[PDB]
Design an enzyme around this catalytic site. Structure first.
Site, PDB file in Angstrom:
ATOM      1  N   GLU A  29      70.046 106.537  -4.423  1.00 53.33           N
ATOM      2  CA  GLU A  29      69.506 105.508  -3.552  1.00 53.33           C
ATOM      3  C   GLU A  29      68.482 104.560  -4.158  1.00 53.33           C
ATOM      4  O   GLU A  29      67.685 104.961  -5.005  1.00 53.33           O
ATOM      5  CB  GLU A  29      68.835 106.186  -2.345  1.00 53.33           C
ATOM      6  N   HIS A  80      56.452 121.519   3.666  1.00 55.78           N
ATOM      7  CA  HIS A  80      56.096 120.839   4.903  1.00 55.78           C
ATOM      8  C   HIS A  80      57.123 119.794   5.352  1.00 55.78           C
ATOM      9  O   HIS A  80      56.983 119.197   6.414  1.00 55.78           O
ATOM     10  CB  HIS A  80      54.677 120.250   4.837  1.00 55.78           C
ATOM     11  N   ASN A 116      67.813 100.908  -2.126  1.00 52.82           N
ATOM     12  CA  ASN A 116      67.483 100.358  -0.813  1.00 52.82           C
ATOM     13  C   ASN A 116      68.006 101.391   0.189  1.00 52.82           C
ATOM     14  O   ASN A 116      69.230 101.590   0.302  1.00 52.82           O
ATOM     15  CB  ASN A 116      68.194  99.024  -0.594  1.00 52.82           C
ATOM     16  N   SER A 136      55.888 112.322   0.573  1.00 49.82           N
ATOM     17  CA  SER A 136      55.842 113.784   0.633  1.00 49.82           C
ATOM     18  C   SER A 136      57.132 114.444   0.133  1.00 49.82           C
ATOM     19  O   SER A 136      58.228 113.983   0.442  1.00 49.82           O
ATOM     20  CB  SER A 136      55.563 114.209   2.077  1.00 49.82           C
ATOM     21  N   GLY A 137      56.988 115.514  -0.644  1.00 51.38           N
ATOM     22  CA  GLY A 137      58.143 116.207  -1.179  1.00 51.38           C
ATOM     23  C   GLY A 137      58.668 115.576  -2.458  1.00 51.38           C
ATOM     24  O   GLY A 137      59.395 116.219  -3.219  1.00 51.38           O
ATOM     25  N   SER A 166      49.904 107.985  -3.566  1.00 52.61           N
ATOM     26  CA  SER A 166      51.148 108.209  -2.841  1.00 52.61           C
ATOM     27  C   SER A 166      50.654 108.256  -1.389  1.00 52.61           C
ATOM     28  O   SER A 166      49.441 108.320  -1.138  1.00 52.61           O
ATOM     29  CB  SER A 166      51.814 109.526  -3.253  1.00 52.61           C
ATOM     30  N   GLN A 177      52.057 109.035   3.115  1.00 55.18           N
ATOM     31  CA  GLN A 177      53.075 109.668   3.928  1.00 55.18           C
ATOM     32  C   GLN A 177      54.430 109.000   3.742  1.00 55.18           C
ATOM     33  O   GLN A 177      54.538 107.763   3.672  1.00 55.18           O
ATOM     34  CB  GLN A 177      52.687 109.733   5.398  1.00 55.18           C
ATOM     35  N   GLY A 178      55.476 109.825   3.607  1.00 53.81           N
ATOM     36  CA  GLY A 178      56.807 109.301   3.381  1.00 53.81           C
ATOM     37  C   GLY A 178      57.213 109.639   1.960  1.00 53.81           C
ATOM     38  O   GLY A 178      58.402 109.745   1.650  1.00 53.81           O
ATOM     39  N   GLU A 215      75.396 105.609  -4.037  1.00 54.50           N
ATOM     40  CA  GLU A 215      74.868 106.629  -3.133  1.00 54.50           C
ATOM     41  C   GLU A 215      75.836 107.785  -2.974  1.00 54.50           C
ATOM     42  O   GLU A 215      77.036 107.616  -3.084  1.00 54.50           O
ATOM     43  CB  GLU A 215      74.598 106.074  -1.733  1.00 54.50           C
ATOM     44  N   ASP A 244      53.166 124.852  -1.051  1.00 55.59           N
ATOM     45  CA  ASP A 244      53.937 123.796  -0.418  1.00 55.59           C
ATOM     46  C   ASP A 244      55.136 123.404  -1.288  1.00 55.59           C
ATOM     47  O   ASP A 244      55.174 122.332  -1.905  1.00 55.59           O
ATOM     48  CB  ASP A 244      53.038 122.596  -0.136  1.00 55.59           C
TER      49      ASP A 244
HETATM   50 CA    CA Z   1      71.244 102.475  -0.186  1.00 61.52          CA
END
Ligand code: CA
Ligand code: IMA
Length: 223
Positions: free
Chosen positions: A52, A40, A54, A177-178, A172, A174-175, A62, A84
């Site tokens: 990552e 999704h 921040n 997800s995955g 958990s 939204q955000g 990064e 999913d």
């Molecule tokens: Ca960063």
């Protein structure tokens, strides 16, 4: 993550951020060139961000790599969220190190009661919106199938499991997800759905990765 804690910079080295001008989903690095996320979360123009902490500041460590191919599971159903799961091939292999490392796929499914670590940059509020800059963590146990199905009657398939707290307050959201659900060093789940966030008697629902190991392996081998 609602009711979680600040992980600590690079303490979850397999966690990736799916970015399209902003963070929209999480994912897990399973090898130098492949990421596992939720079906999704699919969209074009995905930039995978590794190492990552921040997500709004470049701090070092990064690695921004473009997705080469996004392979949504052929039987994914957007209404039921069954299957999913999605694999993303990186345009180039990531540089593995202490800050960026892959997570192992399971060899067997996890049992009810197993404690797992869920992480992400998703909403931290059950009521309202509040997105963090840094990665949040939450330790949560896998619930019994009976408790899962009684919470979401008729909506739980064999490719889903519940994890969390029936009392509410930790979940958990939204955000996230995955993102990963890791238990004993193995990726057992993928943040999928739920009703609201951290609501009483409405635990989070996750994609049961142990049911897809053969698929993941066969797909990666042919791509
Ligand atoms: Ca960063
Ligand atoms: C399968 N059904 C049909 C029941 C279905 C189909 C799609 C859906 C799709 N809806 C969402 O998934 C969703 C959007 C959303 C926005 C806000 C708060 C929670 C949200 N959720 C649940 C959500 C997202 C991520 C994590 C958690 C969590 N609480 N652990 C909860 C929701 C239900």
């Amino acid at each position: 993550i609602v009711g979680g804690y600040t992980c600590g910079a690079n303490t979850v080295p397999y966690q990736v951020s799916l970015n399209s001008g902003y963070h929209f989903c999480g994912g897990s690095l399973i090898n130098s060139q492949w990421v596992v996320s939720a079906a999704h979360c699919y969209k074009s123009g995905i930039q995978v961000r590794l190492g990552e902490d921040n997500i709004n500041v470049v701090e070092g460590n990064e690695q921004f790599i473009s997705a080469s191919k996004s392979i949504v599971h052929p039987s994914y159903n957007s209404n039921t969220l069954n299957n999913d799961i999605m694999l993303i091939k990186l345009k180039s292999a990531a540089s593995l190190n202490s800050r960026v490392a892959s997570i192992s796929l399971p060899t067997s499914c996890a049992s009810a009661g197993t404690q797992c670590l869920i992480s992400g940059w998703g909403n931290t509020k059950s009521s309202g919106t509040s997105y963090p800059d840094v990665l949040k963590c939450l330790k949560a146990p896998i619930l019994s199938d009976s408790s899962c199905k009684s919470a979401y009657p008729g909506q739980i398939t064999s490719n889903m499991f519940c994890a969390g707290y029936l009392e509410g307050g930790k979940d958990s959201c939204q955000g996230d997800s995955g993102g990963p659900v890791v238990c004993s060093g193995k990726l057992q789940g993928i943040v999928s759905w739920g009703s609201g966030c951290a609501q009483k008697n409405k635990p989070g629902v996750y994609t049961k990765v142990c049911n897809y190991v053969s698929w993941i392996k066969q797909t990666i081998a042919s791509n």
